[PDB]
Design a protein around this ligand. Structure first.
Ligand SMILES: O=C([O-])/C=C(\CC(=O)[O-])C(=O)[O-]
Lengths: 405, 405, 404, 406
C-alpha cells in the first residue's frame, strides 16, 4: 500500500478509532443518564493513543482493559457499557473505510483530470484502432483517452452512491437488540451515530455483511478498469509499437487480480449464520484492508503514469502506414463509389486489397494498376482516400461529448 | 434457471432483439436521409422472428443475411449500415438485462412483502440468538425477519441505481467512432437510443465491460443474502432444532456459489485490450445468462419458502429453556445489581451458573440455594428474572423501525 | 465444448452410464444370491438406452422407474437394490470423467507432438526474448517452444497421478455404510467395482469431494498453460510484430477464465456437511461438465493452431534489429574486455549504448566513434559482436534437454 | 499464521536463502573455473545474515548482493551473482521455503491422521444419527465419521508427495532462460547448483511457467477444503441443541479455507504470463503464496489441536437418536416383517404405521404393536429390537477396519 493508505489501516490508527468510539459512547450514555458524568469525563480524558502500552488475543477488550486500569478511582469501569466487541471493530472499520475512500476520491479526481487533459491535447492525433491486437481502423489517441474518462466517471458515481449505505453505525450489542441497555439502547445507538457522523442503523448487521462486500465489489470494478489502462499502455509501450512511453503499470495487474478474488471471498462471507459468526468476520478482517491497500497501489501508479505519460505521434503515424493503406479500404470503397459503379467500387477495391496484401504492396499501387481506376480518377485524389488521417471518423465530436458533463 | 427467466435469455428472444434493433436502425437512418425511405419500409417488414429459418452459425450476421436475402428488390442491402456485430449483441443484452431485472424487482417485492408479514406476525415469538451456532441471548423471531427485510430493501436500492447506467445503448461501429456514418454517426446513435428507450452512451464501451460487471457484482451481493437466508432456515429446520419448517433451500446454496465465482470471471473480463476483444466478451456472453438463471432460481425458491414458511414458537420455547435460565443469566446479574452491588452481583451469578452447569440444574434453584440471594430477593422475581421471555430487549421497537420506511 | 466431449456429458450418454451401472449391480447381487438369477438376467436385458422414453425431477429414479415398470413379470423390482441415488450419479460421473480424460490425454499427445516438432524444426531461429513486453536478449523460437513442451509434459504427469484416485466407485447407500445390504454391502461394493473397472473405495465419499475437486484444479492448471500459449501467439501475431500467424486463440482466454473461476466453486463445494448434502453436490453437478467442455474447447483450438502454426523467421530477425545492436550489449562487453580493459570495456560500451539510444543510431556506429575502440580492433569483428544472432546462448542444448 | 510457519516466510529466512544460493553459485562457478577460487572464499565467508544491515531498499535481491559485494575485500566480490538474474534467486529461494513449509505440513498431517486413527477405533461402535441436509437419515457410528475424514487426509498426503518431486526444482536460467553470459558453462553451472542445493535440475527455464507454484496453491486449496468440512462438522456437532461433541477454534479454520481457495484462483490466474519474464504474474505469486501458506498452517494447527482434545459425549448421540422414537430405523422394521409378511407388503404397511406414530408423536414400537397382523406374526421382544437404532448400524466397524489397515 501507500504511506497514506498503509497508515489508515495501521494499528495505531485502528485503536485510535477504538478510543474515539469508547469516548463517544461514554459521552452518549452520560447524557442519557446511564453512567455518571464525572466517570465519563475521565473515560474520555484517557482515550488518547499516546497513552497505550503495546502489550503482546482480544483486539478490543485488550484496549478497554488498559483504559479501565488507566482511569482514576475505577471510573474507567463505566466504559464499553452494553456494547459488544464486534460493535467496536465494525464501526471502526466503517470509520476506516471512509478515510480510505477519501483518498480514492482524491486519486480518482487526479486520474480524471489527467485523462481530461490527454483527451484534449491528443484530440486529433491519429492512430490504429486494434481489435484482438490486430489493426482495425483509424482513431485518435484522444478518443482512446476519452473512453477511459467516461469509465472512471461511472466509477465515481458508484463510489458516491454506496457511501450513503456504508457510512452506517454498528451498535447492536450481543444479539443485535441491546438487551442489557434495555429501552435506552435505541437512544444510545442513535446518539452514538450522530456522535460519530454516521447514519443510524435500521437494524443490526453483525451477520449481514452486504455493506462491506459492496465496498469490495466496487474496489474490484475500479481495479478492473485500472488494469485495462495498464494493459493498453504496456501494449502501446512495446518495443515493436512505441506509440507511448511510461514515466509501474505492470504492478496494477497483481493488485486487480488480488482484489477481484478478494471480493469473491467477501461475497462468500455474506453467507453468515444467525446473529454472529467468527469465520465470516475474519474473512472481512483480512481481505478488506488488503483490498484497500492493493487499490491504492493501483490508483497511485495509475495516477502517476498518466500525469507523466509520453505520447509519440510519429510512432503512431508509422504504425498506421504498416497496412500501406489497406486499413482505410472502407474509405476508398465509399469514395470511389461515385465515379465507378457502386457494385464495382466494392468489388474492385476488395479484389485490389487481396492483390496488394498477397503482394505486400500499397493499396494505392494496386488500385492504379486497374485501368478503369487509373482512367476515371487521378492519383492526387486516389491517394487522399488511402490516407489513414482522412478516415479518422467523427471522434473529436465524441471526445467533446465526454468532456461536457 | 426458471421458465420465466430462461425465456428472456432464450435464442428466440435474442434474435427477437436483433430484429427489433435492426428495424429501429432502418427507421432512424431513413429519417436522417442515410438510407432510402422505401428500403426501410421493407427492412422493418421482415423484422419478425416468425420469418427466420433456424439453420444455425454466426450470432448476428446469420440473421442479417436472412433479412437481406428476405428483402425483395435488393432493399436488404441497406440494413445494418455503419453498425458492428457487437453493437447488435450488446444492445440486445442491455434489453435482456432490463427484462431480467423486471423479474428480479417483482420477486424482491414478494420476498420483501413476506418478510414484513413475518416480522409482525412473529414479532413477539421469542427464540435464542445464536453466535457460532452456540446460544447467546434471547431475541424474537420477528427481530430476525426484520434484519433480512432491512437488507433486501438495500438490495432494491442498489438495483435501481445500476439500472440508470446499464440501460445504455451500444452503437459505435468498428472502433466506436462510426466512421462509415461520417457526420451522421452521433445523429444516428442518439436517434437509435431514443428509438429503443435506452440512454445514449457518452462514448463507445465495446471493451469497457464495467456496466455488465456492475450487474454481475449485484447478483453476487443479492444471492449472498439469499444464501444466508437459506442457511438460517435449514439450520432452524434441523431435526434437533425444529424451530421452523419449509413448505428447497439447499438449491439456493449452489446458486450463491456459482454466481459469486461467475462475478469474479466478469471482473476478470474487465481487463480487456484496446478497442475490441473476443474472449472478454465471451466470458460475459457465457456467465451473464448463467448467472441470471441461477439468481432467478434462488429468488423463486426464497420467495416460495417464505410465503409458506412454517414457524413453531413451541420449538423456540423448548430450545430456549434448555439452558434452564443460563441464557438469561445476564438479566439476573443486573437485577441483583440494584439490591447488591452491580459488580458484586455479576461475580455471584457467574458462580451460581457454574454450579447449575456442573449440576445440570435450573439456575433459579441454584440462585435460591444461595441464602444472600434468597434474602435480598424473593422467589417470585428470581423466577421472573430467569424467564427468557422477559429479557428480550427493545426488539419490537427495532422491528417497527425497519417497517417505517 | 466440442462434439466429442459434449456428447460424453449428454443426457443420452449419462443415462447410458446409469443403465450400465444398474445392470452390473443386478448381476453382482444376483451372483451373491441377493436377488433371483432370472430377475437379474431379465433386468440387465432392459438396460438399453434405446428402450427409454426420452419424453420423460429425479435424475436417476426417473430412469429406474422406466426399468422397473418395463421388466416382465415385475422382475424389475430387484434393480437399484440397496443403492442410493447419489451412488448412481457419482459413479456415472466418475465413468464420464474417465471418458473425458481419454480425450484430454489424446489432445496432450497431439499438442506435445506438435511442440516436439516445432522445437526441433525451429531449433536455431533467433528472435528477441521479451520481459514485460519489452525486448531483452536473443533466443531461438524452438527454445520458446521447448519451455511450453516441458510444461505440457508436467501436466501429463499430473493427469496420470490423479487417475488412480479419481477412478473409484461410489456405492455407500444412504449413510455410506449400506445398512439395508447388511453384511453383503462390502461384498456387493467390491464386486461392483470390478464389474465397472473401478477401484473400490476405502470408505464412502458422498460428501468427501476431494476427488472431483482435484479434477477441477487440474483442469485449472492445464487451461492455465493453454491460456499463456494463446497469449504468446496473439502477441507474436500482432500487426506490428508479425512473428507468427494463426491458421482462434482468443477463445482460450475465455475457456481458461471460466475454468479457473469454476475450480474455485468446486473448492468451495468441498465444505460439505455431515454424511450427505444437496447444494455442495449441486455445485459439482453443474461446474464439472462445464469445465470439461471449456477445457476441450481450449485443447481443441490449441491442438489445431499448433499443427497449422505459421513461423516467419524474417519478421523475427527484423524485430531483433529494432534495438540497432543494443540488445547484445552484454555480448559486446565480454568480447571487447580482452582487447581493451575489462572495467573500461564495461564502462565504455555502457556509455556508448546510452549515446546510441538517445541518438537512435546503431551501437556499432557509436562504438567506432570512440577512438580507442576504432584503433585496437577493426570493424569486421566489431560487427560480429553486434550481431544479435551470435548471442543465442545454450538454447539448442536446452532444447535437447526437453526432448531428452 | 504459526511462529514456525510465520518464520519460514520471514524476511530473515528469505535473505538467508539468498546468501545460501549466492554461496553455492560462487562455489560451483569457481569449481568450474568460471570465477576465481580466491574470490569464492570471500563470497562464501560473507554469506552470513548476521553481516547484513537491515537498510530496507525499495530491489529485493540486489539490495543484498550489493551489501555482499561491497562487504568483500580486494574487489573479489565482483564475481558473485554471475550469470544469475534477480528472479533466479527469488524463485529458487521460494522453492527452498516451500520445502520447509511442506515439512511442517507433513508433520501436522501425521498428528491429524494419528488422532483420527485413535478416534475411529475408540468410538468405533459409538452410535449416532447420519444427517443428510442437516436432517436425520439413518444410524451410523462416530468412528465411521472419523474414518471418512481419515481416508481423505491420507489421500491429501499422497498428493503432497507427488507434487514435491515437481516443486523441488532449481531456478537458474539467467535473463531469458538461456544463460547467455555463462556461455557453454551455463548448463554445467545450473546442474552443479541443483546438486549443491539438493534440488532437482530443471529441464528448462520456468520464469513464466508458474505451473509448479500453482500446483502447490491448488493443493493448499484442496487440503484446507477438507479442514473446512471438519470444522463445520465439529461446531455443527457442538451446537447447543446437538451437543454430540465438544471442543477443548474451528470457526477460524473456516476463514482459512475461504481465503486459501480464492488465493488459489489468483495463482491460477498468474499462470497467464507473457513471454519470457513478467512482473505482476510474479507479484501475484509473491503475495498470495506466503499468505496461503500461513493460512493453511493456522488451519492445520487448530485442526490438529481440536482433534487431539476432542470431547465426545456418546449419551447425546443416543439422546438425539431416540428423538425420532424409532422412525430413524424404520427401514429395519420393514425388512424384519418382510420375511413373515413379505418385503413389498411390509414397507407399504410400516410406512402407514410411521405416519400414525409421527402424527400422534408416539413411539414406532407402540403403533406397530397396535396392528394385530404385526403383533401376531412378530413378538414384542424383536419388534423392540428392530426399533432400536443400535441394531441397524450396518457394516461400519468393517469399513473402519478397511480404512485402518493401510
Ligand atoms: O525484480 C524481480 O524481483 C522479479 C522480476 C522482474 C521482471 O519481471 O523483470 C520477475 O518477476 O521476473
Amino acid at each position: 500500500g501507500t504511506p497514506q493508505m498503509r497508515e489508515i489501516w495501521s494499528d495505531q490508527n485502528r485503536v485510535a478509532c477504538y478510543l474515539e468510539i469508547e469516548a463517544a459512547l461514554a459521552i452518549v450514555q452520560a447524557d442519557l443518564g446511564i453512567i455518571p458524568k464525572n466517570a465519563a469525563h475521565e473515560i474520555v480524558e484517557h482515550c488518547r493513543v499516546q497513552e497505550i502500552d503495546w502489550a503482546l488475543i482480544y483486539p478490543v477488550l485488550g484496549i478497554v482493559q488498559q483504559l479501565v486500569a488507566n482511569c482514576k478511582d475505577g471510573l474507567g469501569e463505566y466504559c464499553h457499557w452494553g456494547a459488544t466487541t464486534q460493535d467496536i471493530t465494525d464501526t471502526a472499520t466503517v470509520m476506516q473505510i471512509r478515510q480510505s475512500l477519501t483518498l480514492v476520491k482524491q486519486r480518482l479526481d487526479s486520474i480524471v483530470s489527467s485523462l481530461e487533459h490527454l483527451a484534449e491535447q491528443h484530440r486529433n492525433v491519429p492512430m490504429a484502432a486494434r481489435s484482438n491486437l490486430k489493426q482495425a481502423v483509424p482513431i485518435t489517441f484522444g478518443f482512446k483517452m476519452a473512453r477511459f474518462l467516461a469509465t472512471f466517471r461511472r466509477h465515481q458515481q458508484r463510489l458516491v452512491e454506496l457511501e450513503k449505505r456504508v457510512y452506517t453505525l454498528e451498535f447492536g450489542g450481543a444479539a443485535g437488540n441491546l438487551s442489557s441497555l434495555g429501552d435506552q439502547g435505541i437512544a444510545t445507538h442513535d446518539a452514538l451515530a450522530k456522535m460519530l457522523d454516521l447514519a443510524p442503523a435500521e437494524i443490526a448487521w453483525h451477520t449481514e455483511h452486504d455493506r462491506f462486500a459492496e465496498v469490495g465489489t466496487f474496489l474490484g470494478l475500479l481495479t478492473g478498469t485500472l488494469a485495462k489502462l495498464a494493459t493498453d499502455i504496456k501494449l502501446m509501450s512495446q518495443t515493436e509499437v512505441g506509440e507511448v512511453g511510461e514515466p509501474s503499470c505492470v504492478y496494477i495487474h497483481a493488485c486487480a487480480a488480488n482484489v477481484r478474488q478478494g471480493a469473491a471471498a467477501l461475497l462468500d462471507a455474506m453467507q453468515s449464520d444467525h446473529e454472529a459468526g467468527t469465520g465470516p468476520w475474519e474473512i472481512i478482517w483480512v481481505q478488506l484492508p488488503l483490498m484497500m491497500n492493493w487499490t491504492s497501489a493501483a490508483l497511485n501508479n495509475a495516477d502517476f503514469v498518466l500525469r507523466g505519460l509520453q505520447v509519440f505521434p510519429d510512432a503512431m503515424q508509422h504504425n498506421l502506414d504498416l497496412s500501406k493503406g489497406l486499413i482505410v479500404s472502407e474509405a476508398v470503397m465509399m469514395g470511389l463509389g461515385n465515379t465507378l459503379g457502386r457494385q464495382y467500387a466494392h468489388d474492385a477495391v476488395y479484389e485490389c486489397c487481396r492483390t496488394a496484401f498477397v503482394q505486400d504492396r500499397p493499396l494505392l499501387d494496386v488500385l492504379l494498376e486497374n485501368h478503369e481506376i487509373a482512367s476515371k480518377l487521378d492519383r492526387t485524389e486516389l491517394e487522399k482516400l488511402c490516407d489513414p488521417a482522412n478516415y479518422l471518423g467523427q471522434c473529436s465530436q465524441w471526445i467533446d461529448r465526454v468532456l461536457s458533463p
